[PDB]
From a paper:
We report here the crystal structure of the cyanase from T. lanuginosus (Tl-Cyn) at 2.2 Å resolution. The structure of cyanase contains an N-terminal α-helical domain (residues 1–91; helices H1–H5) and a C-terminal α + β domain (residues 92–161; two antiparallel β-strands S1–S2 and a helix H6).
A decamer of Tl-Cyn is formed by a pentamer of these dimers, with intimate contacts among them. The active site of Tl-Cyn is located in the C-terminal domain, at the interface between neighboring dimers of the decamer. Malonate (Mal) is situated on a two-fold symmetry axis in some of the dimers of the decamer, while two formates (For) are observed in the other dimers. The carboxylate groups of Mal are recognized by six hydrogen bonds from residues of four monomers, and formate has the same interactions as it has essentially the same binding mode as the carboxylates of malate. Specifically, the carboxylate is hydrogen-bonded to the side chain of Ser127 and the main-chain amide of Ala128 from one monomer. One of the carboxylate oxygen atoms is also hydrogen-bonded to the side chain of Arg101 from another monomer, which is also involved in a bidentate ion-pair with Glu104 from a third monomer. In addition, a unique feature of Tl-Cyn is the Tyr14 residue, which is located in the center of the structure and helps to reduce the size of the central channel. The structure of Tl-Cyn shows substantial differences to that of E. coli cyanase20, even though the two proteins share 40% sequence identity.
Numbering used by the authors:
A (entry chain E), B (entry chain F), C (entry chain G), D (entry chain H), E (entry chain A), G (entry chain B), ...: 3 to 161
F (entry chain D), H (entry chain C): 2 to 161
């Protein structure tokens, strides 16, 4: 049971999102398999499919191969640079993504306070950054999602 | 350099937020020490101070002792249940917090797709949930903040 | 008189909402009947028609046969995972749905207080959850609608 | 462990909300107890404390005696007619109340379709209406909250 | 000079609004004439054309006859239940409609206060309701529009 | 017995005189019917004035002082100047009764426009050169209905 | 350099806007020449092109003649009544238009106070109204744009 | 005799000096016409200043002190610095008179742009290098009309 | 690696935006080369491509020639006056642009104070205005982007 | 003529903004002077007064001295970390600040294009960043405001 895309309900994504997701659906591939094939993490590979990351030339050749899309089709639809941020309309209505938003809402200042006392005045980068999703089962049989955010600490300049 | 609160700029927190923070600032206490005193994680303790968590009866006694605030004051001001979600006006303006929001915006559907392929149709709980902040220094000497989200997977029911 | 869908006035539903509802109108089926044939409740069945639930493999088969739609059409249209939340533009403008919104608005803190006193600090899940609609005619011949919401109580973690 | 109010974080409730809850907190009363004394349902009683219902003359004498508030103070503050709808800032930020909102959002059209097929063109009233909260414990020791909405069906007129 | 519709500028109406309005234009009919033929009031009839009312089986027949649209086209386009509320983007931009909104704004609490003193705690229904438009010409020769709203008084239940 | 009141803790951004007028209304247990009869303005208009949405004439000020027991100099100062209408209802209206009127506008707006366009041409019904009232109707069955009448001057668009 | 319209960038204008503007572009006509031909001011004439005015039967004939569009085609597209207010998305993003909005913002209460002192309690009509644009060139040869607003004074009724 | 006044209970986020000026304006029964003539600015401009929407020159401060009877030292400390324009009107305007001006921008905006574009080219009419006035005409049928004139400097977009 | 446009994700640009970018993409041209060819600044050139500047008759000729587009296509698509301001939905969601908005957010009043103290009461024009982007490489080999805003000082008039 | 603050019109600044600005007005200090005393630029120094920067310990001693405020008052009011982003309500209403917002709107995608072609996929940092304001005079005697943004280029990571 694999993630698919229906652009009837999901506007403003790049044309290649449809192209990639349609080939993904035809071949019944998971993002884990595609990720492995392109040498990028699962989340980043899915982010790429939603228009939220940039395909290197190697990614383009690797996707063409595993998805069965001719390279020239990807080179022309996946050219230039990502125009990030249109995939999620805020505030999020999708329940799973809403919970992530809720976490920011209820822990924002808590995270800021802790980060500030650990690092000082600055931010955790969302650019010089990686993230991953893991699945875990505990001893009682409960399942847990573990999302890790790892971003570079950037102090505010002094000028 | 410790985290503090000025309610002139930060409205709609509980009255206890000012009472707790004023006392944190006057004792020059870090959230690390307060968290260790109360047996709760740093983020959670910070969250409590911003009105975003509930103090147990033991938390009240322990906060009273380390902050030098009489127990009867905390009991009255920290009674009832938290009314979460007013501390961050959306979209966030504060840069640090904004970066976390941007993460949800740019990765939301990537996260969903990966989580759906690993767990099926459902959510990661923001309720049955924990989070932590850690610091990593890499071999190159640069600092990284690592924020971990860990929430129970809930499938949608069939009914 | 049965419920139908006109996508001219109702955007951002999946393509399959159109496919399903046109077959429903063509056969003159009610949701009560469709529901008995898939093994899901009336409300859930209608939520699935509006893109707000996921069809199991058996749902797709049983829908295929009650609606007269080729199994392969529903398998490509109803693949992957729902992207819930787009079917109602908030605040709701349709009067009936608006009343449910108004109830949230006028009772939401009341519910919270009562739930908090009965269960503690937590939520009633909307994921591990079910709902029904029933009709009652009272002693005096007046009709009432009865919506039941049944959600799992989730306490906040201590961490 | 009872519900309390801190108007610092919860603006635009009537003055009597503060008077009622301060007495409630001082006497350590539950809404269950207060409701029993005034002969009203628990939810309706809590609604009344948030300025979302009107107290009859008997409700005022009874609230006055159970809460130990001089009856003439309540008479001056609880006069007139409620000005409902200000207690919940939309969309709701408090997580418990948000889930009720998300329900409306994900089930709105579903409820409308089922209700239309059972009653015709009209609404479930939110005025000629009652509601309740019950606790169920299923055979596996898991708690569920059950919220019942019961509103009069009103058909649209023909004119 | 009769009312027309151009969907180029008015989105989110049902497909049927175009069909009715095109036939209305083809036969140069006024809403007065159509209303008389279907036995409904002018305002109701116009609302119907904008997707804001339900056509009874008799209305569908009479509409077909007076507009020259085959009864089968109308039955298929006008099936199901109205999804009211999308015709006017709020706040209204069309000046005539804006003035109605300015009245609600400037008189809303006035109407409530006077309604409340006359009827008690409740609402005037917009469901169990009728409305008309009349033209008065005074003795100085000035024309006045008179809009009447007639709604059933509904008191809040005691529960 | 049961009269309209104002609690400014829940209702911000009204003129200071709204509080003053409404507190004297409450003390004296007056209805808007009675106050209207004293000042010579209709019930709805009177209530509107109290919510900051109308301008008291010099006679209004004297008559409100009299009927309300407020010294004239106090109304004179508090009710000087010109109303700044539009702040009493935060849009969209949250109060159910008021929301119902907004719902009417929402669901009948274009129907009204179409009917008024066919009877009067291109223009508007004025909300300025305008009156309104509330009546009660009890039908044969004993059911109670509220009847709100909107009476506004027809203004055609100019031609230039 | 004449004004033209590109509907790719400017949605929700009536279909006739395109029709008129395409002819305007084809014949290289200014709004001055068209205005002169129809016997209306330039601003009015442009307003009409943007769907914000109603053409009389003579306007239709004159437009037809000057633009080379058959009378019947224009009549079929320009009948009924204007549905004003959709051409400018608020707040305006186009800089020229934004400056007029800023004028309203920074002079609104000023204008109201001066109008109130001159005329009393009321409004300047935007309906019984006309407007023009003129060009002045001063001593140093700078151009100034003069916009004149002339609207009927309407006092609030006493009722 | 019926003069504009201000009640800050209902009108937030104006500078402290708005209340100072308007309270003195009310105490002396001054019109903006009279204040404006005393300070040598336009009536509109003078009202805009009272709403915190303009800057008083040092001469303005002296002349306001004198005509309003407020000590010069008070006005200097309150009226110091630079205006922070644009807080006086919550958008969209709910005040009806102000709303009509907003509806004019809405309904005429692209018309004004087209006509301006054809007369002047690619550019704006400034709202900074700008003046405005209010005048009253009375037509042959005794109807009154408000005439608002906006006069702004044309600025072409640069070529770079 | 050049900037391209995909209108699937970027609505409400003029028709010519697509025409110009498609040609830029097919010839693999940078904005620096196009800018050099038409004698305009790089930033100004890219702004023209997104519909935010006016092409002179020479620009239309030079663009047509360097891009390999029929001059008559550009003459007609690039007619009229720009309707600036639709290319960025506010608040910006694209991270790079968002940083510019955050700068305005965090330094706006600081800029205002410093500009006021150096020039008096007025604005920096965004109309008599130029801007540029430059790359700086420091001693440690870190790259910096330097954006210069150069606008005419316009004092407020005295009237 | 120096910049001052009136908190009556400017809410949500830290308490220290009032304290610093009032001292500034009492001493008739310009930001240029205060900046030179603390060893930061004018813009940074003004940002500090509006709550948008953090004072170092030397800044506090220097501010105290040039402004005449007891070091101890500044130490308690200026403790902790800035909570940036509240000083400007978006979109900006103040005309000067609005023009900067209008530049972001009209040049946002242009900057992004040119930045992308010069640096690749990334952002200009607003954290690792400085900015200045300069006054310039041209050949003709015209005054120009020059705002420089200098931010660190951050590429998106590959993960």
């Amino acid at each position: 049971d694999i993630a698919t895309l229906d652009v009837t309900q999901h506007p403003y994504l790049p044309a290649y999102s449809k192209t990639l997701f349609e080939a993904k659906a035809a071949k019944k591939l998971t993002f884990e398999e595609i990720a492995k094939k392109i040498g990028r993490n699962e989340v980043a590979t899915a982010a790429l499919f939603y228009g939220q990351a940039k395909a290197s030339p190697e990614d383009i050749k690797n996707l063409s191969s595993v998805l069965g899309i001719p390279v020239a089709v990807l080179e022309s639809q996946m050219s230039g640079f990502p125009d990030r941020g249109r995939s999620v309309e805020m505030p999020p209505k999708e329940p799973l993504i809403y919970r992530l938003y809720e976490i920011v809402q209820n822990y924002g200042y808590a995270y800021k306070a802790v980060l500030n006392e650990k690092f000082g005045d600055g931010i955790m980068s969302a650019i010089s950054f990686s993230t991953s999703v893991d699945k875990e089962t505990d001893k009682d049989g409960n399942n847990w999602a573990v999302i890790t955010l790892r971003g570079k600490w950037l102090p505010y300049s002094r000028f």
